[PDB]
Design a protein around this ligand. Structure first.
Ligand code: HEM
Ligand code: HEM
Ligand code: HEM
Ligand code: HEM
Lengths: 146, 141, 146, 141
């Protein structure tokens, strides 16, 4: 999306330090705990009654890594988020029936997790670039809904 | 909070809806499904074609729930308790969707009640639907 | 704004029947009555304390006509909303300091007014087209904010 | 509604904030102005440059109102009635903006309090900021 070069490169450099497996697990887990209604898509994952059960759930963890893996591969296509996520947008709509507002919630949770991990390094300008990224991904994921 | 004047306006406007409630509920849903297609994600099990029986049936249910709230306007959290539980624990509809249905209900009332949909009444109905939405979303977390 | 040609003809068809002067005063007036916090921009307009004071205020009616006149003009340029509204976007941001959420609220109120005026003619499909149009205008008016 | 566990969680987190409240308030504002530029429309009278003193001073006031809220967590409407009136009748900030500052405050807290910002505490803090927001916009209409 409308990303400044200093912004594009702030995103990229930070992302190179991210452990996708850990962040993925943490982002999805936090989504389920903070906004409990998002659990509606994951009844088959098992016990999600408490935060500890959610955060320790291996299916939550593995799904988080999958989701962030796809997000990660999308950061190499910032000039074409729409085409990169098109088939995923269709699947989310036609097969999974996921309200796109969930993509927005995950984005903001993701931004909180990055702040939690990187502390001082996640400065106000770095946040603003990631907010643009997460909204761009959300919008690309919702683009094929009908 | 609803004011005495709000309550009067809502009872009057809903009074004129009368025995049209069901029809108007189904119309509000069709408007929502076409203007805001993401709302369709919550009804994958319905036939959503124009005039669908599932849509008419659901319209009546929504409309009856609103009629109940108006009948109990001084005690809505208790009158809608069961529905509040259902949305929070089973249906789990994202809160943003309530604003979308509310708007479509207002458009529907405006389209059918030209004499009664004055600025003051529009204002009170919008506040009323926001209060219903709040109650229905109150137990989410 | 992605509009099918049949959506574009419904929009234009209906708009042909609108008295922009009258609908402009009704829409602006109802915005200030239903969402009273929007009165923060109009303190020089005089008395806005009751619904009849707002709806009949000659300044509200004149301002409504001005807003809707510019909106009309945009309906002739649906393929270039951003360009059409660029100088107004700048003005609303830098001089008037208007939160763009106000444009979304006005759009929604305009849709209620159209429904009020046209009754059954404002069918679900026609509404749906108008919702894409008001969102597109709101988005264009917000596009120069910084 | 805030559960007993939420209040405890919010009191503990805010307790560690301690003498940094004002610095965090200012930082949350800066993050909001940068991430969500439309919010700057409410502060056309401020110098919004990095480190300007108006943001600092304002960050202190916001942080102290939050401290007061945490201390009056069981009686919020009353403790914040004055700020509620101020926002509803003078400032008239559109309700959508409260969500934006709340998010930025959470990011600020996650940034400075890594051991305390557990998933359960993240949940409680988001509920708390939502309740504060609700209180501050309760008299708008
Ligand atoms: C960053 C945003 C997201 C991206 C990039 C992403 C990506 C993916 C991918 C790559 C898959 C695998 C699909 C396949 O096997 O072909 C998937 C599955 C799925 N996603 Fe997402 N996703 C996102 C957000 C969400 C959110 C927020 C939810 C709901 C809260 C959700 C619900 C699902 C569900 C229910 C599945 C199917 C899992 C299963 O097979 O049991 N997704 N997602
Ligand atoms: C004005 C606000 C609303 C009210 C008064 C309302 C009321 C109701 C009622 C009375 C039922 C039937 C429950 C029963 O069978 O006893 C129901 C079910 C349902 N509602 Fe809500 N609702 C509201 C908003 C929404 C929203 C915005 C959505 C999502 C877009 C939604 C999605 C559903 C779904 C999916 C069901 C289950 C339908 C079925 O499977 O038969 N509702 N609601
Ligand atoms: C469809 C969206 C809108 C359009 C097309 C529009 C258009 C216009 C135009 C053509 C002007 C006059 C410009 C000038 O004086 O040079 C104007 C002024 C103004 N607009 Fe907007 N407007 C819109 C929405 C709004 C909204 C929703 C609000 C606030 C609730 C707002 C607040 C104002 C204010 C305060 C002025 C200046 C009034 C004065 O002269 O004192 N506008 N607008
Ligand atoms: C967490 C929610 C918020 C709280 C607790 C809060 C608290 C406060 C406090 C304590 C004041 C100072 C009143 C005085 O000087 O005595 C104030 C003023 C103000 N607030 Fe709110 N605020 C919140 C959210 C917001 C939002 C989201 C905005 C708009 C983006 C906003 C805009 C303002 C403005 C413009 C002033 C006047 C500042 C000045 O002119 O000095 N506030 N707020």
């Amino acid at each position: 999306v409308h990303l400044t070069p200093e912004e594009k490169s702030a995103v990229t450099a930070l992302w190179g330090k991210v452990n996708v497996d850990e962040v993925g697990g943490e982002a999805l887990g936090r989504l389920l705990v903070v906004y409990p209604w998002t659990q509606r898509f994951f009844e088959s994952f098992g016990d999600l009654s408490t935060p500890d059960a959610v955060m320790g759930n291996p299916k939550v963890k593995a799904h988080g890594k999958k989701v962030l893996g796809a997000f990660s591969d999308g950061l190499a296509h910032l000039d074409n988020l729409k085409g990169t996520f098109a088939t995923l947008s269709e699947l989310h709509c036609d097969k999974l029936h996921v309200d796109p507002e969930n993509f927005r919630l995950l984005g903001n949770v993701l931004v909180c997790v990055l702040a939690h991990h990187f502390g001082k390094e996640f400065t106000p300008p770095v946040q603003a670039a990631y907010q643009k990224v997460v909204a761009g991904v959300a919008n690309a994921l919702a683009h094929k809904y009908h | 909070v609803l004011s005495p004047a709000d309550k009067t306006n809502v009872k009057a406007a809903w009074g004129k809806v009368g025995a049209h409630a069901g029809e108007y509920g189904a119309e509000a849903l069709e408007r929502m499904f076409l203007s805001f297609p993401t709302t369709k994600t919550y009804f994958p099990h319905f036939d959503l074609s124009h005039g669908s029986a599932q849509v008419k049936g659901h319209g009546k249910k929504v409309a009856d729930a609103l009629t109940n709230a108006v009948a109990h306007v001084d005690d809505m959290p208790n009158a809608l308790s069961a529905l509040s539980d259902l949305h929070a624990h089973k249906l789990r509809v994202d809160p943003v969707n309530f604003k979308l249905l509310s708007h479509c209900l207002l458009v529907t009332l405006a389209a059918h009640l030209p004499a009664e949909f004055t600025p003051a009444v529009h204002a009170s109905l919008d506040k009323f639907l926001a209060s219903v939405s709040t109650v229905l979303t109150s137990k989410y977390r």
